[PDB]
Amino acid sequence: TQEESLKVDQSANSKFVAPLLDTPKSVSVISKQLIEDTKVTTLADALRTVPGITLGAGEGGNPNGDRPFIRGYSSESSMYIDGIRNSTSQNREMFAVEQVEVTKGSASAMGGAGSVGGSINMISKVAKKGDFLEGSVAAGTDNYQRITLDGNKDFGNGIAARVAVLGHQNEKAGQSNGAEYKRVGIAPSITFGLDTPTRATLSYYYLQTDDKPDSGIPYWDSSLGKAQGKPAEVKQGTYYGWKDRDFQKQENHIGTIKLEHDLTDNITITNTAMYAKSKNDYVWTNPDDSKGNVGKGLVWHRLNSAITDSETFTDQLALTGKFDTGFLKHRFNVGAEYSKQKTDKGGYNIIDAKGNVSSTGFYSDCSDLSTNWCTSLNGPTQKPFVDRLQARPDFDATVESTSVYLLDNIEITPKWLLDLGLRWDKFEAEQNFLATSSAAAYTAKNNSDFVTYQAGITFKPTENGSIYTSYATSASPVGLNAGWGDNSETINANNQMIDPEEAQTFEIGTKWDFLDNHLNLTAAIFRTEKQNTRVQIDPTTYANVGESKVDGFELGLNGEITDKWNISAGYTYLDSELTKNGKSCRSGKCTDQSIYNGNQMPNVPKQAATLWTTYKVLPQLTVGAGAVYSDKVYGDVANTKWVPSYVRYDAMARYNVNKNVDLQLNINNLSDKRYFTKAYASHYATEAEGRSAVLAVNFKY
Ligand SMILES: CCCCCCCCOCCOCCOCCOCCO
């Protein structure tokens, strides 16, 4: 069946009005079958299958959740759930996810603000026709246990209801007395009017976590005695967090009402209303914060924290369908959107027994260990936290947007398709800051309005082939993180009046369905760039004079090579350049970065590739193998802090016990490679999980 294919022909996003073969834009789909084969449980893990998507890390001024970079540009503020932005900081789960669609290239005409290098859209499982009950019970090394249940009941009168439930725990693999994850979720929905002209779907999503959060490995260069170079040479799986102090609790609720009416057999009006509540409460450890203790065999437990509470309402109204004038065939989506988000943000003060207060920590010089503020670089041991944390409010933030767009793919003849999109956005961000020890209370506000677009031509040499050229723009206003997120987007007194950043993608490509439509190959060559980047000029002045660009190549191959052999593979070459830099400022002092003009962009590898392939060795036995490769990744503009290249292997075996029951073994990071998945701009990098195994009993009725 098609549900079992690694090749996905159509996007579930109704803003992609044409099949992916004929769409003049790069789109990768992390398919249902790939998700099942790999047993990825988080978006972050899932993204490892897409080469060149690099993950970013948190620090003092930005949260430590999902931070995907696409073609060199952060998509943290451009993460979508069924086409609606939901970009509060979260570690997103896969339990209610059908597939993940990664748009690569500038895409504001489809998504509004952001989408500079691309965007991610997670497609949810929802109630549908046909009865079924599916489940998984699994156990794995390092105290992994996971149970999921997914039941769908078709009442046979156009009504169906579905619920997925999740219970999950694991320790980070290979990291003893280290990070720990626990979470529970539920996702019930009900749909009405199946197979009729008038339809309604009510859905709810809930996920709640209770974790001991990861730390990282500090950068160190022994020759220089400085916090730079590669991560310190310490034992694999070393944890520098402070388990008695550190924690992270996330809680997310999403409620959606979607109403559809078919005005004709070819034109549908849809209204989607989404209500989201998102909380994040955390304390985690930066290993040494570049204080130099590493060179004396010690690590200071620098504290990073935040407490956020966000509520968002979004409504999208879209008219979709097709109209054939006789000469031209239009495939369209025209619409309007409104959203409003409000966020409260605070963090933690640390108070010692004498009443001293800090937001960062005590004894950063490791002069006194009696309250356990530093640990051993080699063989750290977990100790009590004996100071006190106290919640402290910092600011609130309100983002309101309104937009209208037209998307139309015009078939001129069966060989010629003209793709068009045009969108107008109005954006307002307002942030009210409480007084601090160094500044009075103030309000920052940005108002931006901007038009973005896309234009492409697709030529089809045959019905199974496409060759295209396209151009698309993006705009990214200050304050886009809506209070807490990517720190490059944070609004303040001095940038609040600045116009949006401007980006664009020029792409040429080709796509082909082969082997009786069992295989799809894609190739693209592009320049994705931010030709107007916001940069700092001095400690209290900004301007839009920066520039960067990524010249790249992407190749993708998905589907069935034979009726026993399938494949999902990708390659990318990314030649990135920080063409024109501003200054780096800290505590009133700015360092000029023009000396780094021409450097490689951080958080992007020059090359990367992934491969997943499976073979039906017996009719009841499938075996899978994967490889993930990345070149080295820089953390900083100066290109002095980095993590090395790596290859990571995976394997799988699935045995069909009977028609309803499978046993599936996954071995992850099969060679137990020590590598790093995130490189922060300073201080540290995040180690990838070590080797693990998971064994599951999967059922399907
Ligand atoms: C479907 C949206 C229709 C496009 C609205 C155009 C209104 C222009 O708004 C001004 C926004 O800021 C300046 C943008 O530059 C003006 C370019 O005008 C393009 C006309 O299509």
Side-chain angles (χ1 to χ4, degrees):
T1 50
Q2 294 306 333
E3 263 196 58
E4 288 163 332
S5 186
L6 293 176
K7 167 182 181 274
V8 178
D9 293 330
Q10 308 269 4
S11 169
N13 181 349
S14 76
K15 290 191 182 168
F16 281 119
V17 300
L20 292 177
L21 179 68
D22 299 343
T23 298
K25 201 169 194 78
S26 300
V27 182
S28 291
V29 180
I30 306 175
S31 67
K32 182 178 193 285
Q33 189 62 51
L34 184 60
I35 290 166
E36 284 173 18
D37 277 5
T38 55
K39 207 185 169 63
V40 288
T41 69
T42 66
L43 175 65
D45 288 340
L47 288 173
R48 85 175 181 249
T49 64
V50 186
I53 303 316
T54 302
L55 304 177
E59 213 238 75
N62 70 292
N64 64 349
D66 301 329
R67 303 190 66 232
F69 283 73
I70 306 172
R71 293 185 178 178
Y73 298 100
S74 168
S75 73
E76 189 183 353
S77 302
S78 302
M79 309 186 60
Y80 290 79
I81 176 88
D82 301 297
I84 293 190
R85 198 195 305 259
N86 192 52
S87 284
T88 47
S89 187
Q90 306 164 224
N91 302 318
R92 293 162 181 75
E93 248 273 345
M94 295 298 289
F95 84 100
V97 178
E98 182 76 13
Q99 65 202 33
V100 183
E101 303 190 359
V102 186
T103 295
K104 300 181 220 170
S106 302
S108 293
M110 297 190 74
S115 289
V116 173
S119 59
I120 292 165
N121 185 16
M122 293 172 84
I123 306 304
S124 303
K125 291 166 170 157
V126 62
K128 61 188 190 181
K129 65 176 184 198
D131 290 55
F132 62 85
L133 180 64
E134 300 182 43
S136 187
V137 175
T141 51
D142 286 318
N143 290 315
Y144 180 114
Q145 303 163 37
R146 185 182 178 85
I147 295 163
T148 55
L149 257 108
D150 183 4
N152 186 97
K153 199 182 263 284
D154 188 330
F155 288 77
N157 48 12
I159 305 185
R162 185 179 187 165
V163 64
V165 192
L166 168 74
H168 176 100
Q169 65 170 230
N170 76 281
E171 296 173 11
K172 185 183 182 192
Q175 196 190 62
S176 294
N177 298 307
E180 297 172 27
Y181 298 96
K182 303 180 176 53
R183 57 193 176 259
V184 166
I186 189 167
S189 56
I190 182 171
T191 196
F192 305 88
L194 283 166
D195 292 328
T196 81
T198 301
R199 300 172 299 275
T201 303
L202 307 177
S203 71
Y204 172 66
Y205 180 79
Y206 162 82
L207 184 74
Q208 190 164 346
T209 75
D210 185 14
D211 300 340
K212 292 301 187 177
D214 205 1
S215 184
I217 306 300
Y219 294 119
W220 196 251
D221 180 328
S222 283
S223 297
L224 299 174
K226 293 193 276 275
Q228 70 186 255
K230 286 175 302 173
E233 296 291 344
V234 298
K235 194 180 176 177
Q236 181 174 10
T238 299
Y239 181 69
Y240 296 118
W242 191 350
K243 293 182 78 161
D244 200 43
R245 187 193 69 181
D246 295 345
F247 61 89
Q248 179 153 33
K249 295 161 176 186
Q250 302 191 331
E251 184 180 341
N252 283 277
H253 300 256
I254 307 174
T256 306
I257 305 162
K258 181 163 139 214
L259 307 171
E260 313 171 65
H261 182 56
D262 298 341
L263 296 163
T264 71
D265 295 324
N266 292 318
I267 302 168
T268 299
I269 183 73
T270 302
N271 188 262
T272 310
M274 160 165 160
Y275 301 82
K277 171 127 185 134
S278 185
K279 303 178 68 152
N280 195 15
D281 186 7
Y282 69 76
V283 169
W284 65 273
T285 298
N286 169 339
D288 212 46
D289 198 22
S290 306
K291 297 285 177 194
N293 305 298
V294 168
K296 70 196 201 186
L298 295 171
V299 173
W300 177 53
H301 297 295
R302 163 66 197 270
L303 182 145
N304 289 324
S305 76
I307 310 164
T308 60
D309 186 337
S310 173
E311 299 187 358
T312 309
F313 171 70
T314 305
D315 192 290
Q316 297 179 332
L317 180 65
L319 181 73
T320 53
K322 44 206 174 78
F323 183 58
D324 176 345
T325 76
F327 304 144
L328 300 182
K329 304 182 192 188
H330 299 256
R331 288 171 298 180
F332 67 86
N333 182 331
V334 306
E337 181 174 325
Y338 171 78
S339 61
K340 187 183 189 167
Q341 185 180 359
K342 299 195 75 84
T343 298
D344 288 335
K345 186 269 178 183
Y348 290 98
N349 285 330
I350 322 150
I351 307 177
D352 73 8
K354 299 200 171 189
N356 302 118
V357 183
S358 175
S359 67
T360 56
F362 303 118
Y363 306 111
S364 67
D365 66 359
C366 301
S367 57
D368 182 343
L369 269 55
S370 62
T371 54
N372 311 312
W373 273 89
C374 303
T375 194
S376 190
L377 177 74
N378 298 124
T381 61
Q382 290 294 323
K383 300 288 180 189
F385 172 64
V386 303
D387 305 294
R388 184 164 55 85
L389 294 177
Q390 179 160 284
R392 178 204 64 250
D394 296 311
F395 59 80
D396 65 35
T398 300
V399 175
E400 188 168 31
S401 66
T402 312
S403 45
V404 185
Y405 66 92
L406 304 308
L407 294 160
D408 187 13
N409 183 279
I410 306 172
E411 178 183 322
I412 300 171
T413 80
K415 296 203 161 79
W416 293 96
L417 317 172
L418 178 59
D419 194 69
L420 303 166
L422 184 60
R423 177 162 166 147
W424 172 81
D425 281 276
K426 175 177 180 192
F427 173 92
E428 177 184 290
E430 180 169 58
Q431 269 186 225
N432 300 303
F433 296 93
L434 298 172
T436 67
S437 64
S438 69
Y442 82 103
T443 294
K445 181 160 72 166
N446 179 266
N447 286 276
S448 294
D449 82 288
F450 45 91
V451 172
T452 56
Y453 63 96
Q454 75 190 43
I457 299 169
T458 298
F459 175 71
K460 297 183 64 51
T462 73
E463 73 183 322
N464 288 327
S466 150
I467 310 166
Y468 70 89
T469 308
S470 70
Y471 178 76
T473 64
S474 162
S476 188
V478 71
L480 183 61
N481 64 23
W484 202 243
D486 188 315
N487 49 294
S488 66
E489 301 166 9
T490 280
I491 190 170
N492 63 44
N494 307 123
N495 65 14
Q496 68 187 300
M497 72 302 289
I498 306 292
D499 288 327
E501 296 188 310
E502 296 175 82
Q504 65 189 2
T505 295
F506 175 76
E507 184 163 309
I508 52 176
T510 190
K511 305 192 189 179
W512 292 84
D513 274 7
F514 290 113
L515 281 194
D516 289 332
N517 296 304
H518 279 114
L519 274 180
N520 176 267
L521 171 70
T522 63
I525 289 279
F526 54 86
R527 176 173 295 163
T528 287
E529 64 185 319
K530 189 188 287 178
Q531 73 278 3
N532 280 285
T533 299
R534 191 164 60 251
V535 298
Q536 199 167 3
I537 300 315
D538 67 32
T540 52
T541 312
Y542 296 80
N544 260 352
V545 294
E547 307 170 6
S548 74
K549 68 172 168 92
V550 180
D551 290 326
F553 169 69
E554 285 158 1
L555 193 71
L557 177 67
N558 294 270
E560 305 80 47
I561 304 164
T562 67
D563 66 353
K564 301 186 178 168
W565 186 14
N566 64 2
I567 195 177
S568 183
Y571 169 83
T572 190
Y573 188 97
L574 301 167
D575 182 20
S576 62
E577 180 189 87
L578 293 164
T579 311
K580 184 175 168 199
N581 296 299
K583 298 207 183 51
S584 171
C585 306
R586 190 180 56 74
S587 309
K589 187 183 203 296
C590 298
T591 63
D592 183 13
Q593 295 183 310
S594 59
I595 59 172
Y596 306 128
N597 290 355
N599 274 5
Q600 188 174 335
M601 293 172 65
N603 312 118
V604 39
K606 205 160 290 161
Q607 293 193 86
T610 69
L611 167 71
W612 180 254
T613 189
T614 78
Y615 198 93
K616 262 287 208 193
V617 306
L618 299 160
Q620 279 195 316
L621 181 65
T622 301
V623 171
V628 173
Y629 159 75
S630 183
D631 201 0
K632 69 168 168 174
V633 170
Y634 290 101
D636 62 337
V637 164
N639 288 183
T640 61
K641 304 175 192 177
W642 78 91
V643 298
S645 64
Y646 63 86
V647 185
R648 165 229 168 96
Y649 304 100
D650 297 291
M652 184 270 290
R654 180 156 50 242
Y655 184 75
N656 310 119
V657 171
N658 60 47
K659 63 175 306 197
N660 302 108
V661 179
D662 291 344
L663 186 67
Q664 184 175 311
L665 176 60
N666 281 90
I667 300 176
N668 304 305
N669 189 5
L670 195 55
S671 67
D672 203 20
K673 176 69 186 186
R674 182 185 184 254
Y675 70 103
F676 298 86
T677 49
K678 311 170 188 183
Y680 196 64
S682 198
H683 314 308
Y684 80 95
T686 299
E687 194 177 341
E689 70 186 359
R691 183 158 62 207
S692 68
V694 176
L695 181 68
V697 184
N698 298 333
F699 60 88
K700 187 165 313 199
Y701 298 92

